[PDB]
PDB file of C-alpha atoms and ligand atoms in Angstrom:
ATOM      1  CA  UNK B   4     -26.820 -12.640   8.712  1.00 29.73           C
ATOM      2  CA  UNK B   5     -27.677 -10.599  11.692  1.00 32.45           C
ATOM      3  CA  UNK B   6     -29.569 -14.164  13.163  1.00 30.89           C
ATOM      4  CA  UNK B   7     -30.510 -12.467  16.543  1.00 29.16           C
ATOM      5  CA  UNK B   8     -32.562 -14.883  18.890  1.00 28.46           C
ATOM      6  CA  UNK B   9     -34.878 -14.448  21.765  1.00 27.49           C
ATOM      7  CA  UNK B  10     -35.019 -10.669  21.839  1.00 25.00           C
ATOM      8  CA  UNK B  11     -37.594  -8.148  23.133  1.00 23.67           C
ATOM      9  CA  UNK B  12     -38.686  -5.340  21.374  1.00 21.61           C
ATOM     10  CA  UNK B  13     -38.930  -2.129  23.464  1.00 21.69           C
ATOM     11  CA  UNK B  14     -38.835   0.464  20.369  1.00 19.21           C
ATOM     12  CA  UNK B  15     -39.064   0.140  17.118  1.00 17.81           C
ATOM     13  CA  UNK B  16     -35.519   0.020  16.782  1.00 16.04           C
ATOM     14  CA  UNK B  17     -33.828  -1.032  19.841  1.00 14.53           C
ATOM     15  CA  UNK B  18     -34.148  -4.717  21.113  1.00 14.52           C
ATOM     16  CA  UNK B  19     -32.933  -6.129  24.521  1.00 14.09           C
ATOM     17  CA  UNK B  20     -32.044  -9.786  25.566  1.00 13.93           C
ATOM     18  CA  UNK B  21     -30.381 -11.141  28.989  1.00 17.05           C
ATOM     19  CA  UNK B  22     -27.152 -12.668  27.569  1.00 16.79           C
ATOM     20  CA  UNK B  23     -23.309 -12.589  27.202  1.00 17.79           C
ATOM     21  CA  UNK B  24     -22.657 -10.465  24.671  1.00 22.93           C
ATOM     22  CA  UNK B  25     -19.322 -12.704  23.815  1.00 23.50           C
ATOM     23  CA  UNK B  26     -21.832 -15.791  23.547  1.00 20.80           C
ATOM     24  CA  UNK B  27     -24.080 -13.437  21.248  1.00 19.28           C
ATOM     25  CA  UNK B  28     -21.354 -12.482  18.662  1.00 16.27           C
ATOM     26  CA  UNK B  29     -20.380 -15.815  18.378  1.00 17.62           C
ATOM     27  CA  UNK B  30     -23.419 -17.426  17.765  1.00 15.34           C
ATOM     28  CA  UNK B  31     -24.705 -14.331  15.627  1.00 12.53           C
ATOM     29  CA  UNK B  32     -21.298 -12.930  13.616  1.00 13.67           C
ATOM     30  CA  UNK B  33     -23.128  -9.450  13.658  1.00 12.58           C
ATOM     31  CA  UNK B  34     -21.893  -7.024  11.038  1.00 14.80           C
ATOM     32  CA  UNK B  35     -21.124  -4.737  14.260  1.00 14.69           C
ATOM     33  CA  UNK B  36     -20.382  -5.798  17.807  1.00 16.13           C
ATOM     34  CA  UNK B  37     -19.925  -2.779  20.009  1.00 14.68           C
ATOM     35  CA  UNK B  38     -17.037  -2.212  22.772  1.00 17.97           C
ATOM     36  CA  UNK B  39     -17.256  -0.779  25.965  1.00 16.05           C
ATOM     37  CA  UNK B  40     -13.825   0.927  25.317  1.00 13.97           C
ATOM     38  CA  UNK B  41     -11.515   3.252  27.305  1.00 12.56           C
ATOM     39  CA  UNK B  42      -9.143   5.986  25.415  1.00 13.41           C
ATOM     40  CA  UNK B  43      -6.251   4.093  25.194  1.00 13.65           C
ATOM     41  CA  UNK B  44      -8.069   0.602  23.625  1.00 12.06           C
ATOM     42  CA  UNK B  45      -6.787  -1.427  26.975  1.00 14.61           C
ATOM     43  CA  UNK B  46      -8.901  -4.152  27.183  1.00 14.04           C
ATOM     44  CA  UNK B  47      -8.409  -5.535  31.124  1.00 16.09           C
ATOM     45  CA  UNK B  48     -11.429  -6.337  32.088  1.00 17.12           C
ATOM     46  CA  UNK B  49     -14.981  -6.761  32.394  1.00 16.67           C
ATOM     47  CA  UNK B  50     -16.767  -6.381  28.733  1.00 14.99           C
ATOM     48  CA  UNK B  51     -13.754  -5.225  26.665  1.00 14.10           C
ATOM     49  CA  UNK B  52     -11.772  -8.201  28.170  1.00 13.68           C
ATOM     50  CA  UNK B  53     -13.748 -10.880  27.595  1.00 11.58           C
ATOM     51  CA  UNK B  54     -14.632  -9.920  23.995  1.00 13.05           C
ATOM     52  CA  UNK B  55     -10.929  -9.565  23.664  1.00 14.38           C
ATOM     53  CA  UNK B  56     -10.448 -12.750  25.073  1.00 13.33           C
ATOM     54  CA  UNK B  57     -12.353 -14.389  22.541  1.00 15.80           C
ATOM     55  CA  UNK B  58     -10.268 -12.735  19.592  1.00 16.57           C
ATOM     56  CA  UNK B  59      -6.782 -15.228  22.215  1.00 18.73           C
ATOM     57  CA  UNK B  60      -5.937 -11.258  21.991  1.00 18.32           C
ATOM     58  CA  UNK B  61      -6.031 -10.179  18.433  1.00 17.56           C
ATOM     59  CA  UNK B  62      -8.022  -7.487  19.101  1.00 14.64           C
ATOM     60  CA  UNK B  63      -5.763  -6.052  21.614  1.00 16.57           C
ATOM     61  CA  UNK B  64      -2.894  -6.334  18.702  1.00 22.92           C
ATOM     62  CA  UNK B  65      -5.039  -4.539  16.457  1.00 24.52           C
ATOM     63  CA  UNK B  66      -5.725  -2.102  19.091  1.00 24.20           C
ATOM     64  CA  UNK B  67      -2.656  -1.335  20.264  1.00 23.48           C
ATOM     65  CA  UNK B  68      -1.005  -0.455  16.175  1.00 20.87           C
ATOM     66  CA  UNK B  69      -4.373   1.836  15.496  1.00 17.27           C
ATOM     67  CA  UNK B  70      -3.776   3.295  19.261  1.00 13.97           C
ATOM     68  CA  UNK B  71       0.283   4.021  18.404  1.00 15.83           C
ATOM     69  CA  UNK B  72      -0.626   5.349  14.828  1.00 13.52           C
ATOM     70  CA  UNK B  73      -4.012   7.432  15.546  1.00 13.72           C
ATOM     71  CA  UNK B  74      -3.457   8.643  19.504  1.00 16.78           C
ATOM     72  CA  UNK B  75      -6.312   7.736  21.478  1.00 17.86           C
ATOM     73  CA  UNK B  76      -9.748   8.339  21.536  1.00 16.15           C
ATOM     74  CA  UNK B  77     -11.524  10.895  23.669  1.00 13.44           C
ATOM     75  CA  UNK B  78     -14.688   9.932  25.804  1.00 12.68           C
ATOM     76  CA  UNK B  79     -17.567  10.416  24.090  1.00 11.32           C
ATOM     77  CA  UNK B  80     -15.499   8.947  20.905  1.00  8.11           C
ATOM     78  CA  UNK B  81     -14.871   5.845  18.728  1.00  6.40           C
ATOM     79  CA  UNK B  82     -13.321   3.853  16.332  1.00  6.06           C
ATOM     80  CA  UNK B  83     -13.894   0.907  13.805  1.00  3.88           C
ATOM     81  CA  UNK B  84     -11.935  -2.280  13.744  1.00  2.78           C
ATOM     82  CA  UNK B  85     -11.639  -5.812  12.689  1.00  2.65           C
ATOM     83  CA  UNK B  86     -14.149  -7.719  14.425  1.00  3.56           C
ATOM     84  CA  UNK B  87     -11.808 -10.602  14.083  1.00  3.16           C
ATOM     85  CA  UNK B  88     -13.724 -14.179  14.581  1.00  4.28           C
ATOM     86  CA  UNK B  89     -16.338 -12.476  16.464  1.00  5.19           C
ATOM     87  CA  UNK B  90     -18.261  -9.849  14.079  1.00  3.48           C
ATOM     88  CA  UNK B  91     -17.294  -8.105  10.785  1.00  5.15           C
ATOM     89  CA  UNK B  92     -16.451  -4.806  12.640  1.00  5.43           C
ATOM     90  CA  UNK B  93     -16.125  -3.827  16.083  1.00  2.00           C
ATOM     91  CA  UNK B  94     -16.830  -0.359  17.141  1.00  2.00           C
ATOM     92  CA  UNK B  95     -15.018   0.478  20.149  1.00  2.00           C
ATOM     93  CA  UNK B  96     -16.918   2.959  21.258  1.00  2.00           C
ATOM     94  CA  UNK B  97     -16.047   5.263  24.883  1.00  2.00           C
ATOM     95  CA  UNK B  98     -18.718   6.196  27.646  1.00  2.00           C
ATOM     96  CA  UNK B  99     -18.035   8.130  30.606  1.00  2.00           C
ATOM     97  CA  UNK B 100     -16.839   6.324  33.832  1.00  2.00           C
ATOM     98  CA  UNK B 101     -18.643   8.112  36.306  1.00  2.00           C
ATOM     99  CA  UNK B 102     -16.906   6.140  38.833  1.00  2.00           C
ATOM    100  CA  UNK B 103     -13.732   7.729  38.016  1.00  2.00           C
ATOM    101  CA  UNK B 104     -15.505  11.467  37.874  1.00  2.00           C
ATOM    102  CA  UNK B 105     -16.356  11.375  33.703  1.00  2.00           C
ATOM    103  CA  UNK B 106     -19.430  13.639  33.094  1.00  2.00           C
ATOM    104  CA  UNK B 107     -22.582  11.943  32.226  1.00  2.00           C
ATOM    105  CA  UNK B 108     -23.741  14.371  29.369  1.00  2.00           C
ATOM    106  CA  UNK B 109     -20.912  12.469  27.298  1.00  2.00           C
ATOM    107  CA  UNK B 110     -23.375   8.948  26.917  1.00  2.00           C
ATOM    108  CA  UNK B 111     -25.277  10.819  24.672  1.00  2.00           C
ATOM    109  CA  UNK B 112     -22.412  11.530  22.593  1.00  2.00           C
ATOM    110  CA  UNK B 113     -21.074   7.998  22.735  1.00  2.00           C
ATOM    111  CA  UNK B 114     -24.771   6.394  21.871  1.00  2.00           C
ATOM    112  CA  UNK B 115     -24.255   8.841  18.503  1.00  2.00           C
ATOM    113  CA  UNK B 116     -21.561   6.878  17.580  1.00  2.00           C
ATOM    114  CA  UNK B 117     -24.045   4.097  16.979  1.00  2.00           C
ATOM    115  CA  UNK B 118     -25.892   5.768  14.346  1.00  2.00           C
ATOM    116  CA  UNK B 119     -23.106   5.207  11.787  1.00  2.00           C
ATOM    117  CA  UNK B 120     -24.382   1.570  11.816  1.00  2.00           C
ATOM    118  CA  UNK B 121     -27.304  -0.168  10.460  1.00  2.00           C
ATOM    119  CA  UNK B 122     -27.046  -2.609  12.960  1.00  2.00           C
ATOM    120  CA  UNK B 123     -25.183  -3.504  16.294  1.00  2.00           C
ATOM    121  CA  UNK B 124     -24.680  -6.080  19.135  1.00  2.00           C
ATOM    122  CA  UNK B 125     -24.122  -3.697  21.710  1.00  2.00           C
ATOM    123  CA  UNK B 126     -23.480  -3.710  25.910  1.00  2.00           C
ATOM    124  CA  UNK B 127     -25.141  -0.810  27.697  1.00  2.00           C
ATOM    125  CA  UNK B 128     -22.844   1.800  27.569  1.00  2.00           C
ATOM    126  CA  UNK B 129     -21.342   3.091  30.993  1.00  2.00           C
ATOM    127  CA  UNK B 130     -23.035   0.141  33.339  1.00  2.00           C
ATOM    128  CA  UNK B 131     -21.284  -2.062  35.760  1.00  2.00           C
ATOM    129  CA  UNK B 132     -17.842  -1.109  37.014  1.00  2.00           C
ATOM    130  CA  UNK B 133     -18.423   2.556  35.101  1.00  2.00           C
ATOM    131  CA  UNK B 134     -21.111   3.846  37.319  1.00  2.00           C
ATOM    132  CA  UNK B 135     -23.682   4.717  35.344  1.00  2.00           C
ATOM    133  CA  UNK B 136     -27.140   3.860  36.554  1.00  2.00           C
ATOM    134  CA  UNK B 137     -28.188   1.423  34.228  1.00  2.00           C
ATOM    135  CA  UNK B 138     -31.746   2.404  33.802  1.00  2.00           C
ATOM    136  CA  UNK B 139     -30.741   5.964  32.690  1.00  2.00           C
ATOM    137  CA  UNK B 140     -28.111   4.496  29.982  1.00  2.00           C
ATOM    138  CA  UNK B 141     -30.981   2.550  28.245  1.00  2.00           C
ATOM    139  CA  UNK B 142     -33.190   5.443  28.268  1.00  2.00           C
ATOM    140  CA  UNK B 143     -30.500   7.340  26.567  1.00  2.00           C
ATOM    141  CA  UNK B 144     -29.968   4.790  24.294  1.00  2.00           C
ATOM    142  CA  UNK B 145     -33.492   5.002  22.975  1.00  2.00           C
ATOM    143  CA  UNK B 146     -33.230   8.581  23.020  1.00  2.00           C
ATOM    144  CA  UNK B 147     -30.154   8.136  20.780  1.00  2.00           C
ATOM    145  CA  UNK B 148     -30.303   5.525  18.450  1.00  2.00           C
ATOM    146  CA  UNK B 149     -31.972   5.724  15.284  1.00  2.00           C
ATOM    147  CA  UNK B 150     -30.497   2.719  14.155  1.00  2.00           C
ATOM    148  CA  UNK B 151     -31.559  -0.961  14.849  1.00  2.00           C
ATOM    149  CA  UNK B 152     -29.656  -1.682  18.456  1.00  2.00           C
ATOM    150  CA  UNK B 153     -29.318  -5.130  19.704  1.00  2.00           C
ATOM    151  CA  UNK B 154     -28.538  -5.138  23.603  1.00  2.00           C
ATOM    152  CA  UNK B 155     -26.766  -7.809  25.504  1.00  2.00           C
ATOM    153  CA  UNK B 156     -27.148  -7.413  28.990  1.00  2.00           C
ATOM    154  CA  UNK B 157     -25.255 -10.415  31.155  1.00  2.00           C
ATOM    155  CA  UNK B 158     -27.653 -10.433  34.520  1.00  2.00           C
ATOM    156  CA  UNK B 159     -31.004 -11.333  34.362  1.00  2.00           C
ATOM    157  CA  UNK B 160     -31.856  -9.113  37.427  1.00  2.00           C
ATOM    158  CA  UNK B 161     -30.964  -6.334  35.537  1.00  2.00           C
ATOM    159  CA  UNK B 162     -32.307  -7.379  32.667  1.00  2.00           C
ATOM    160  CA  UNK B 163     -35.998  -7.677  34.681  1.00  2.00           C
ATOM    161  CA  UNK B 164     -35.464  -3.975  35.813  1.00  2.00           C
ATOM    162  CA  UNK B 165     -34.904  -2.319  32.769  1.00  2.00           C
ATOM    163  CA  UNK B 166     -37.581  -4.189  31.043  1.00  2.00           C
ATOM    164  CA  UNK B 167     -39.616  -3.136  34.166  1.00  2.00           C
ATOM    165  CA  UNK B 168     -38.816   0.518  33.976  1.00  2.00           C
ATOM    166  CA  UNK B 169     -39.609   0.375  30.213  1.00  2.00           C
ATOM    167  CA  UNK B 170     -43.032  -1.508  30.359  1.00  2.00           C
TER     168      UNK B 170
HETATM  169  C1  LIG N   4     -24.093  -4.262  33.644  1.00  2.00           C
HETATM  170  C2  LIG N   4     -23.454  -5.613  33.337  1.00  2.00           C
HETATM  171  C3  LIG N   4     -24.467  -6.740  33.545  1.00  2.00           C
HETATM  172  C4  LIG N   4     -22.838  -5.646  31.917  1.00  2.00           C
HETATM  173  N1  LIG N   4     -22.131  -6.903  31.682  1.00  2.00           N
HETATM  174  C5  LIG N   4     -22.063  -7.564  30.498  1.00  2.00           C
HETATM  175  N2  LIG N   4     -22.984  -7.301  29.549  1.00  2.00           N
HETATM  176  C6  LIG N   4     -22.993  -8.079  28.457  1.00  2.00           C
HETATM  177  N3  LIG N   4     -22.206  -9.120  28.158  1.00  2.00           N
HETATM  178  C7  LIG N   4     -21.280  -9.351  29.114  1.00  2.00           C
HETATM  179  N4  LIG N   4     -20.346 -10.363  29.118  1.00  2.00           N
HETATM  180  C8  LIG N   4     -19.593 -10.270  30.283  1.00  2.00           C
HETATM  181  C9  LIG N   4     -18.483 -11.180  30.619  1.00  2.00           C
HETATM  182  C10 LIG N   4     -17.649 -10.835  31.724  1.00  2.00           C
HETATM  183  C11 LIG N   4     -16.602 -11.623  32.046  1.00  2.00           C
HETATM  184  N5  LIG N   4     -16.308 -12.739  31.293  1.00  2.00           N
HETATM  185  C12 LIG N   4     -15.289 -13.643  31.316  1.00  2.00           C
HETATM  186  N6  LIG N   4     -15.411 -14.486  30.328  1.00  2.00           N
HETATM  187  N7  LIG N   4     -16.558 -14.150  29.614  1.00  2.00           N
HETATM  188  C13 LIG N   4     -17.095 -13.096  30.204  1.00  2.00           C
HETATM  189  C14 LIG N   4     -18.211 -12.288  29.877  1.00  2.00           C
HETATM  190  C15 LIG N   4     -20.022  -9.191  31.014  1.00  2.00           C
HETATM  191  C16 LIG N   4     -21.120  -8.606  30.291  1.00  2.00           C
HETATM  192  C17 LIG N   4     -21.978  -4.425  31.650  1.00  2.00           C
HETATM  193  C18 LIG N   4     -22.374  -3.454  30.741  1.00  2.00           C
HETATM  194  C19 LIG N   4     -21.552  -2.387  30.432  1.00  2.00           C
HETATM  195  C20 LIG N   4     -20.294  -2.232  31.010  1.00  2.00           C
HETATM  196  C21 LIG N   4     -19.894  -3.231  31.912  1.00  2.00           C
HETATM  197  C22 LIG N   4     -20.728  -4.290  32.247  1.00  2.00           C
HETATM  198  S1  LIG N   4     -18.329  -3.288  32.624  1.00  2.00           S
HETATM  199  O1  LIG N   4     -18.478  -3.469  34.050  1.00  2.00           O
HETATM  200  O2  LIG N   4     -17.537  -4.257  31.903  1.00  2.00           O
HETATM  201  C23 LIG N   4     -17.698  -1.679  32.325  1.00  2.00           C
HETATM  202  C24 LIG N   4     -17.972  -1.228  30.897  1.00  2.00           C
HETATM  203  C25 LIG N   4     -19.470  -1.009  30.687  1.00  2.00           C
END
């Protein structure tokens, strides 16, 4: 339960390893994996893709009857699903694109969501294609989370600079 391998501790409750994320939940089946969502639960690309490609698009399904039934979410926002084949849950949870003008006071609000959990695979929140500078999204995830948060980050130069920047 929870087997998570070949992490490093920064905090006492959030852990960090350079690794797919889609790789992680299936050799793990975490009680949580996290989503790097958008409002309407369209998952085209880049994280939310390729975890939804591992579901051959059941999460997508899912998404789109809780999407039709509930509206969507609003940044800063989430929502709990199946985590089909890949976790018990998934938390799709929204973080500001800045690349598409999103304010960045809104991570903070979408690293809450995390909190609800005891524990959770998770990507960092508003990196790659979103904008964010990923060195400021990890600090406010440790500024965040209380609970215990498992990061996958898929680039190992990345990786080296955040665990640079943290020491
Ligand atoms: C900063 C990046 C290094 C990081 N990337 C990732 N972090 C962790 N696990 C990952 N798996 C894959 C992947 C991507 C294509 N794939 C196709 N088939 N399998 C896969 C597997 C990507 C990836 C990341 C963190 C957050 C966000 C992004 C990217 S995003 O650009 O998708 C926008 C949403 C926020």
């Amino acid at each position: 339960v929870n087997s998570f391998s070949g992490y490093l501790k920064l905090t006492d409750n959030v852990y960090i390893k350079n690794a797919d994320i889609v790789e992680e939940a299936k050799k793990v089946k975490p009680t949580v994996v996290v989503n790097a969502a958008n409002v309407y639960l369209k998952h085209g690309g880049g994280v939310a893709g390729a975890l939804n490609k591992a579901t051959n698009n059941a999460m997508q399904v899912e998404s789109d009857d809780y999407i039709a039934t509930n509206g969507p979410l609003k940044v800063g926002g989430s929502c709990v699903l199946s985590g089909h084949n890949l976790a018990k849950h998934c938390l799709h949870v929204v973080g500001p694109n800045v690349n598409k003008g999103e304010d960045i006071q809104l991570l903070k609000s979408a690293y809450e969501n995390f909190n609800q959990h005891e524990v959770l695979l998770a990507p960092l929140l508003s990196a790659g294609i979103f904008g964010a500078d990923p060195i400021h999204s990890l600090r406010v995830c440790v500024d965040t989370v209380r609970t215990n948060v498992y990061l996958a980050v898929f680039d190992k130069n990345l990786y080296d600079k955040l665990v640079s920047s943290f020491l």
